[PDB]
Design a protein around this ligand. Structure first.
Ligand code: COA
Ligand code: COA
Ligand code: COA
Ligand code: COA
Ligand code: NA
Ligand code: NA
Lengths: 389, 389, 389, 389
């Protein structure tokens, strides 16, 4: 039915890193033009662009639109943003598939973009503050990383799952390191060369080409890892190390019918066979990828053991472990090239980021059936099933 | 096969007025509660809440999930927000319709919520400001009213449609005057009591019930309309009087399959027969509703003259006059109870707001074929065809 | 040897009231002009302007110079501000006196100005904020009303005095009401007309003449007072009703030698016979006037009983009561016309505001010896002895 | 009559450099301690602390008092700040001397402290901002560096002086380069060691001792000077190179009578023989030292040629050259160890910084008669004559 023609992600940038001053939509256009070029499709053939983005504050009117226009998609087309937090990137892909499945469109670009780096501070000041201190709110912490129900960090939900699945400091540390290593290796074997399209951070003192994931640490040791203090709970288990970071990035996918691809002689990066989204308690939102991964497989008629390759987003070691334990798929096919503890977690783009890494790596090893899935703040999961053609 | 089982909107509040300190998700909760109540559907049956919102800055993670959970919908359902500017409110309905149409959901509550009063000022400060003055950006003007591409105000784009369509000052003045009068008469005659669910503004100094649109001005005269100076060009045509305002409000629909409604003995407000969205030159985004309104009538197999009732949004008098003039539908069926020039333009929820007025006026005057449409910054249109059952 | 040739003060304004948008130096300018007119001295003859000012953040370079220049004092003269908190207004007079005393100047305009309304919110942003919320600090509260040592509001220093001196809520309220009633009598009898110079608040739509203390309430009851909640301690004793207020205003004196005055045929308001400032524990800063008044009297060779009229500043009812109790002066010659609780308390100006009231009441009643004194945040007091010529 | 018993200044820090996070009063405290220790006088004997300070916004009530308490000056003593812009530090000493001269105090510690690095951005938000962008004002620029009357930067008055005196770019550069070279020589010869007191920047990450002027560049070349662009007028002559810096630091002197000094067996750095402050046109504010020095010399009974040593502050090469040409003093006795262009210019402390450099160099080379002088924004100059004992 619906296939992914092509895909691309920018490298994933460290917080205030290569993209410190690069507005999301600039990362997005690059990625739009990327899927386009790789597919042999002209921008004038794009009906719509759908982009997950949690933090567009201050970036001006509809950053999705801006990104599509800069990428050369004509004014005739349409563009919008959407927000299911860390699910946004993956969900945008599903919402775009559904544009084609309902016949409301023929060709969509979909994914996510996020500049956590560029997120402003804000305060409501219309009424006027008559007397006293007021807080300038970090929209990155407030609108993306803080649970609107208990008022604590996602980091706390992690701790929750930790004590609920009794995961030890070390057990999680072990997860992180393995991730860090798997990521470093993959990078060396050039396993990211394909999916990554380079971004030119144009300066005034000179242009800089970013085409490599700068968040991944080489020479990751469990022992400097073990030296870190917990980031949230004063006597907790979760650390800056066994948890993903704050990052800038973008990623997307050219969607069209399987029929359309044939006519254009395109070798699709895969076929979207199913998807699901499901909720759970906000206090353990990191469990979301479990009900979601099951409803998705259910809808596919796939058994947990049909999966050749999985991409379960590593929002946290504590929760990724929980996911892995509860569903119990073969960990050797889970995050073969390292997860987000190493690569980085650009909120609104993370879902499409892992989608790319799934698809290119599926191609790489000729795997038939893959899955990708992420946890979502507020208490949700999102998952998708892909099958090679 | 997809029907709007029910619908509800808040009264629309004036800028920094009755909802001055009411966050969007709260108006959204009251509205989600009501549609469930008016359809006789339990919160526990809601598969997903989809809410349009342009200005979430500062409101915390996924406000949609915030409205949903406050409305009683269980942690097991899902929620997300989307932004296609003034088109958001309607688009969400279209997206929700798709959820059930693809067989991914049974029951959605969709629409939007906007608090332009609560919108904060922001500034990007992570690098720090080494030296000199910097600007605190008003996210309402920046993310909602400012064209990303030409940098001027939506009002300036109206001036564009004004010059392109040669619409004089008195021409728009009269348009606004009628709007105001039709809004005042509709309010007095009680034609708004149906679609409005009362909102309780909890105040430390006592509670207040808001159930009336407070933006409508009683006794709008052509003369006082012509005493105003241009709001966007020293020697221009657009004024405060012939443009919509800045407003707060929320509005939703409850969709399910036509079969589902029959199983429940629910008499739907309408069936969604078609929808569309098109793009145009950002300079004249006001023209947006023309390609969209048409594309929607075509997808429906309807002639223009087939329409019994039309809701075509009045972002500005200039642009609405233009849309009416092109499509040439009988004006006396356009904005029968007045438009956003009087009632208000709560951006994110505006699309769902006109859909509300549409449905309840279609029911009371017994109209069969209806359509709402809105224009969208960055040059875009949205439209939906509805039909009673 | 040094006399006060003339005096003047603006009306004292309410917080965000009459002078809500008037910069301190504009208030300053008017007052400088007044003491000039009243003395028959030309702007051209001024040597220096000394103005106490606590909260000048954001007002531009050396506001004191801005005022002198706005008043047509020549560029060849000099101006500066100084800051001894609530003691600033009077201290500036002692400082002006010294200039002349040491032969370094002949004619000084001295006093204070304050717009607490105009005081801005600020934050150090150079280093930048990587992550998280920061506080926008209210400079008024931070730089004028909070103890830098103990972290608490001046009101809390007042509670400290109330406990040590065992002054009850009722003893305090009574003092406050008495202050209000005296001030109201004085205002109604016109006893403030001499000292006050009108100030014209320029405004787009209409200029407004402010020539009456607007913060003085009429017919205020012991009852309403007794019903107020403690403002600084949820189970304290100090309230908004028995503390001074937050206010805008300016006040000045024109200093010159007794001989210079005699050559000019000026009949001075008084002779500055001595002054003094002394420190005390910051925790009980309201006791400052006790030591300071004693030192000043001792310097002047006066017994407390020699005083005919006293202006003992009312920062707080608690401290005002403590001062009188320790000092023992006939309370019926203290704040004869009411004090800061009823009149207002523009910190940087307050010292000069009471000097104005002292001087003009001494004149009208034929009093020979007077004293003025204020308490000083952070643990200080200042006083000045005046003798009629 | 009045002598300077001892003196001390901190190393002068670079903008956001060594003291990027060090509040002025912390620098002030160290320097109060230093003068005490140096004179052999105990903290308990201090009567009053007078500290010039131009940018105290955000530091809290009366930083002067905070500095004094931190150095253990007793609570019974007093403290205040004052502001004559760049003249503050020197003016504070004249003020301090006056306290003693008029018999009101015996022991005074006076000078200035400034943390331009810690100066915050601010904005007046009490009235509320109904809509639209607003400025966060940099207090350092607004309250320290911008003329209040013409609205331009101090550097523009420097340009004005350049034209009037016809000072070429090359001649300004030569002056600046000479200054850098004189400072480098003194620093390496150890000529700044006597005046400097170490300051420990207390870092959680291990303490740091700051005891050298970090702003003084080594091996600077006339060639890189000459390439620099004009910083204020895009076709002017004044640049970052031939203009002074933005700096942090503090300086003070312990004051007491000659008789008192003798009774304690102290050998004073010098006798204050006279001082003066004079106004000039704000447009050429950099000319202040001309009439101020002349007034001081005259008051001292001295001819210009009587001077053995001079500290004429170097706000800008252009003004320094004007002053030297008008006064005619042998340039080889002016700023013998380099000036502000090379050392730094922390507004409020500058006046007392050059007092330090003057005093120790006078002691070092047995110079008998010296003079310090600085220009002041708003059109003023201050100067003081010193004589050895
Ligand atoms: C966890 C978190 C709070 C950490 O805060 P942080 O202090 O800014 O992170 P940092 O790594 O920069 O903190 C400092 C240190 O950790 C270190 N560190 C991180 N990973 C390490 C590793 N694997 N091995 C060794 N050291 C490591 C150092 O780099 C460092 O020392 P430094 O002082 O020289 O820089 C933050 O990154 C976060 O919020 N992550 C999760 C966000 C989220 O939940 N996204 C969506 C999911 S729902
Ligand atoms: C146009 C706009 C900027 C108006 O600015 P504004 O002047 O601050 O709004 P106001 O209502 O306070 O107008 C000011 C005055 O005109 C008046 N006025 C407005 N309509 C009037 C009428 N029909 N008859 C008589 N007076 C009228 C006011 O009551 C008012 O009186 P005052 O200024 O003397 O106090 C604002 O409403 C807006 O942004 N409109 C467009 C929004 C938009 O683009 N939405 C999305 C579209 S894609
Ligand atoms: C005391 C203080 C905290 C008050 O805060 P505030 O409540 O915002 O000021 P308000 O006057 O509006 O007090 C609030 C209420 O009490 C009332 N009230 C105050 N004084 C009253 C009186 N004398 N009689 C009857 N009612 C009175 C109000 O009118 C008001 O009613 P509302 O809130 O229902 O509308 C503030 O004014 C303050 O800081 N004063 C002194 C600070 C200081 O130390 N100055 C320098 C000297 S060291
Ligand atoms: C002039 C001023 C604006 C400096 O601007 P700035 O660019 O922010 O500060 P900088 O020192 O980093 O100057 C910029 C550059 O010129 C260089 N430069 C400065 N002085 C130099 C010198 N003496 N020799 C060679 N190069 C020099 C830099 O090192 C730098 O290079 P970069 O662009 O690669 O970073 C600031 O110092 C100021 O406002 N001075 C006036 C202070 C004042 O008026 N006091 C009160 C008077 S009464
Ligand atoms: Na103090
Ligand atoms: Na001269």
């Amino acid at each position: 039915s619906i296939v992914i023609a092509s895909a691309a992600r920018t490298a994933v940038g460290s917080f205030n890193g290569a993209f410190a001053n690069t507005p999301a939509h600039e990362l997005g256009a690059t990625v739009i033009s990327a899927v386009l070029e790789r597919a042999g499709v002209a921008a004038g053939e794009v009906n719509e662009v759908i982009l997950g983005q949690v933090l567009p504050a201050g970036e001006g009117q509809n950053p999705a639109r801006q990104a599509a226009m800069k990428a050369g998609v004509p004014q005739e087309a349409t563009a919008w943003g959407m927000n299911q937090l860390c699910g946004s990137g993956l969900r945008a892909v599903a919402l775009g598939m559904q544009q084609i499945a309902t016949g409301d469109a023929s060709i969509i670009v979909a994914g996510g973009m996020e500049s956590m780096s560029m997120a402003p501070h804000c305060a409501h000041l219309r009424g006027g503050v008559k007397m006293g201190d007021f807080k300038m709110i970090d929209t990155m912490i407030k609108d993306g990383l803080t649970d609107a129900f208990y008022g604590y960090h996602m980091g706390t939900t992690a701790e929750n799952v930790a004590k609920q699945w009794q995961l030890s400091r070390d057990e999680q540390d072990a997860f992180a390191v393995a991730s860090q290593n798997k990521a470093e290796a993959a990078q060396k074997d050039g396993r990211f060369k394909d999916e990554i399209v380079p971004f030119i951070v144009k300066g005034r003192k000179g242009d800089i080409t970013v085409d490599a994931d700068e968040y991944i640490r080489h020479g990751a040791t469990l022992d400097s890892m073990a030296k870190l203090r917990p980031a949230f709970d004063k006597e907790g288990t979760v650390t800056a190390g066994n948890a993903s970071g704050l990052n800038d990035g973008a990623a997307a996918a050219l969607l069209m019918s399987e029929a359309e691809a044939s006519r254009r002689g395109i070798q699709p990066l895969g076929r979207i066979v199913s998807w699901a989204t499901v909720g759970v308690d906000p206090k353990v939102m990191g469990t979301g990828p479990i009900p979601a991964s099951r409803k998705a497989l259910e809808r596919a008629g796939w058994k947990i053991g049909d999966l050749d390759l999985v991409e379960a987003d590593e929002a946290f070691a504590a929760q990724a472990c929980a996911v892995n334990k509860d569903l119990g798929w073969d960990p050797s096919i889970v995050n073969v090239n390292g997860g987000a503890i190493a690569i980085g977690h650009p909120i609104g783009a993370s879902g499409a980021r892992i989608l790319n890494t799934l698809l290119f790596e599926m191609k790489r090893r000729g795997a038939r059936k893959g899955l990708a899935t992420l946890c979502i703040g507020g208490g949700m999961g999102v998952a998708m099933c892909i099958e090679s053609l």
